[PDB]
Amino acid sequence: PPAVPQSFQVAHLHAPTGSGKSTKVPAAYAAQGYKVLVLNPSVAATLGFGAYMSKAHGVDPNIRTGVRTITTGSPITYSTYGKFLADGGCSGGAYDIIICDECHSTDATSILGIGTVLDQAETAGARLVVLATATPPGSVTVPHPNIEEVALSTTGEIPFYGKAIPLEVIKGGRHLIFCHSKKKCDELAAKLVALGINAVAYYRGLDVSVIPTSGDVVVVATDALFTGDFDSVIDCNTCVTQTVDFSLDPTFTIETTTLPQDAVSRTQRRGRTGRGKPGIYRFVAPGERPSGMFDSSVLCECYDAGCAWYELTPAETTVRLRAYMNTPGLPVCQDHLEFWEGVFTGLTHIDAHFLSQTKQSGENFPYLVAYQATVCARAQAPPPSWDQMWKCLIRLKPTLHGPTPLLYRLGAVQNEVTLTHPITKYIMTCMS
């Protein structure tokens, strides 16, 4: 815990989970008479701090999330990076100390939020910025006290990612099995449920309240997932993630790649067990990628977010992303700020109605999707395909004729394509 500097400084706080980085530290800071802001990526976590802080420190802090804002008049304020960004960044409140919790997060919202703080804090009159994380870049998953780890072998009743799982290890007790995809979760759950195992699947879109709080159960899930009280965690050791492919067909492609998990993934997955009692962790693979790297698609995602949700100009987003990149000790990505800024700067005059639809649909890159939809509508051309991503253009379907003026690829392109649209040619110059 960095002492409050005489002048503005940015500090890194590397301390293990449970050490109080997002609770004890801000409590000690505020007790010294400071206005402290704690930024966290999770809406659930942010809300949770309220009760924990009250119980642990007799503090009722202000809570700011997209769903609910609870103002208490406390010197401590907990907020998600999203809400912070939405409240205008440093102009949304006056804080002396900003704790950027879980600063290892490589999701667009955390990166944009951190960069905002790094760029704005000093000028806004803050005294200290703390980048806190139990897993700084270059991290690896080191032995845990309560967790026995054991490799899966080829011996077992259930084939699992090249290895196999012995029914005996899951027959009694509560266990958590991590699969990389929802299909695999379903398939495994089905397999086990057939073998008499009380297996239930869980992933984004499902209902977590159906998972029993007590009693034997094998939850087969993705990273979407809680008082699990799991006797063991079995991990596939791989993860699906967004990746950009500068494919020049005609421009770029944002898809997904199944990669070996990194240290954050392994630590968090393994971390579901051994909570206040011994646990077992079974794995298919012994390796993991050191934490600390993130894909350029995240940068694209940051610009998309500024445009879709934060009223930010690509030039403005660049200022924040630049600050993030200028500060040592944070996760790293390839310096593609000029490139992505170039791309988004040309995506002018979007259809406001499509945008509102796309960001309401939970579309991953709402600005890119809505923009491609805009270009199609204006050309009375059909979307790249008729997959759910293009529901916005359904009502107009009968009128849409001709080849799709393809801007980039966000999915499968089934319709005929034209590369003559001005925007397509523009983005192509960004590739050169």
UniProtKB/Swiss-Prot annotation:
Residues 2-154 form the Helicase ATP-binding domain. It is a peripheral membrane protein. It is found in: Host endoplasmic reticulum membrane. Mg(2+) 1 binds at residues 22, 102. Its cofactor is Zn(2+); Mg(2+). Displays three enzymatic activities: serine protease with a chymotrypsin-like fold, NTPase and RNA helicase. NS3 serine protease, in association with NS4A, is responsible for the cleavages of NS3-NS4A, NS4A-NS4B, NS4B-NS5A and NS5A-NS5B. The NS3/NS4A complex prevents phosphorylation of host IRF3, thus preventing the establishment of dsRNA induced antiviral state. The NS3/NS4A complex induces host amino acid transporter component SLC3A2, thus contributing to HCV propagation. Interacts with protease NS2. Interacts with non-structural protein 4A; this interaction stabilizes the folding of NS3 serine protease. NS3-NS4A interaction is essential for NS3 activation and allows membrane anchorage of the latter. NS3/NS4A complex also prevents phosphorylation of host IRF3, thus preventing the establishment of dsRNA induced antiviral state. Interacts with host MAVS; this interaction leads to the cleavage and inhibition of host MAVS. Interacts with host TICAM1; this interaction leads to the cleavage and inhibition of host TICAM1. This is Serine protease/helicase NS3. The chain holds residues 1216 to 1650 of 3011 of the full protein.
